[PDB]
């Protein structure tokens, strides 16, 4: 459950290191995004020398949340943090490698490149 003014750390190789949410795409009155949803966001903290600079407006996808998703089989998954991967106009990441586990639901949202690079797809 991520809405505007919510911060979540970045989980790939790009220069960004923390990001604040600006808007949730999908509808006129939409107010909450979860695993597999694309958001507009800004960079609040960046590592020196990175490609992505501080104060930049970028799009990104949600890979794990503290209140995860429920599967059709009646099972649940939850993580210990909210994470984020910066993506391009298409569904390809702007970084080189992904850190930490990644939810399986992205395989159902055609995010095939991010799934391949993840160390674990839970």
Partner RNA sequence: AAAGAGAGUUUGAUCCUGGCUCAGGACGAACGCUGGCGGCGUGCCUAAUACAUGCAAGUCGAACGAACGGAGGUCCAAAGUUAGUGGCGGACGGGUGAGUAACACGUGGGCAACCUGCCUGUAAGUUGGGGAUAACUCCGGGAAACCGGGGCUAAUACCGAAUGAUAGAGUGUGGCGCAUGCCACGCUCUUGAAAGAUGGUUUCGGCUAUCGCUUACAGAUGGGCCCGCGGUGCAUUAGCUAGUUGGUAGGGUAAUGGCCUACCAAGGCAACGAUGCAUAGCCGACCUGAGAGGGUGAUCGGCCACACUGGGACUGAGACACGGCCCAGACUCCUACGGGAGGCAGCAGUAGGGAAUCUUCCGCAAUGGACGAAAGUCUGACGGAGCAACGC
Partner RNA sequence: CGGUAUCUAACCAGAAAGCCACGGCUAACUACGUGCCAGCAGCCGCGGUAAUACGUAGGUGGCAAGCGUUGUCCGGAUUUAU
Partner RNA sequence: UAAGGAACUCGGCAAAAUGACCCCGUAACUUCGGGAGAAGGGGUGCUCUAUUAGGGUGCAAGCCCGAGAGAGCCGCAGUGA
* Bind-site residues for Mg(2+): 5
80 binds RNA (CB under 7 A): no
Six-digit token pair at 112? 């095939």
Distances (CA, A) of 65 to 33, 85, 103: 10, 12, 9
89 binds RNA (CB under 7 A): no
Total residues belonging to the chain: 122
Q: In the complex, what is the shortest distance from the CB of residue 81 to RNA, in angstroms, rounded to a whole number?
A: 8
Residue 114: left (phi > 0), alpha (psi -120 to 50), or beta? alpha
Name which of residues 4 to 43 contact RNA (CB under 7 A): 4-8, 13
1 binds RNA (CB under 7 A): yes
Q: In the complex, what is the shortest distance from the CB of residue 67 to RNA, in angstroms, rounded to a whole number?
A: 4
* Pick 3 or 110: Cβ nearer RNA: 3
Give the span between the Cα atoms of 47 and 112, in whole angstroms. 27
Number of residues that bind RNA (CB under 7 A): 17
Question: Of 53, 70, 97, 110, which one interacts with RNA (CB under 7 A)?
Answer: 97
Q: Which residues are known binding-site members?
A: 5
Which SS3 state, helix, strand or coil, does residue 113 take? helix
Place of tokens 């160390």: 119
The residues of the shown chain that bind RNA, judged by CB under 7 A, are 1-8, 13, 65-67, 82, 96-97, 120-121
């Amino acid at each position: 459950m991520i809405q505007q003014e919510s911060r979540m750390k970045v989980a790939d190789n790009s220069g960004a290191r923390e990001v604040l949410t600006i808007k949730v795409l999908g509808g006129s009155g939409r107010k909450t995004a979860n695993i597999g949803d694309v958001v507009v966001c800004t960079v609040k903290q960046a590592t020196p020398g990175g490609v992505v600079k501080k104060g930049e407006v970028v799009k990104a996808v949600i890979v794990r949340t503290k209140s995860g998703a429920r599967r059709q089989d009646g099972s649940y998954i939850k993580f210990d943090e909210n994470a984020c991967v910066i993506i391009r106009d298409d569904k390809s990441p702007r970084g080189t490698r992904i850190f930490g586990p990644v939810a399986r639901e992205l395989r159902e949202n055609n995010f095939m490149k991010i799934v391949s690079l993840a160390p674990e797809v839970l």
